[PDB]
């Protein structure tokens, strides 16, 4: 469920937040996303 505060457990990556659609350019091997501060930003759905 998108656009709602939920606790996600994506492939063992625990956390909390709001998730929705995006327009990244994830390369085939890419799995995660971060920033210059090294914090998990975007996750690829394992079953989607």
């Amino acid at each position: 469920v998108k656009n709602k505060c939920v606790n996600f457990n994506f492939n063992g990556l625990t956390g909390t937040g709001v998730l929705t659609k995006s327009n990244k350019k994830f390369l085939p091997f890419q799995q995660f996303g971060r920033d210059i501060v090294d914090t998990t930003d975007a996750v690829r759905d394992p079953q989607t």
């Binding site: 990244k24 994830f26 390369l27 890419q30 995660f32 996303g33 971060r34 920033d35």
Partner: peptide, 24 residues
């Protein structure tokens, strides 16, 4: 047979260290 000539690498041989998407 084969040779063993030496050349320069220049800028070459850089890979993605991890599988973490990054931008800007």
């Amino acid at each position: 047979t084969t040779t063993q000539s030496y050349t320069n690498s220049f800028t070459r041989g850089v890979y993605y260290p991890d599988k973490v998407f990054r931008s800007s």
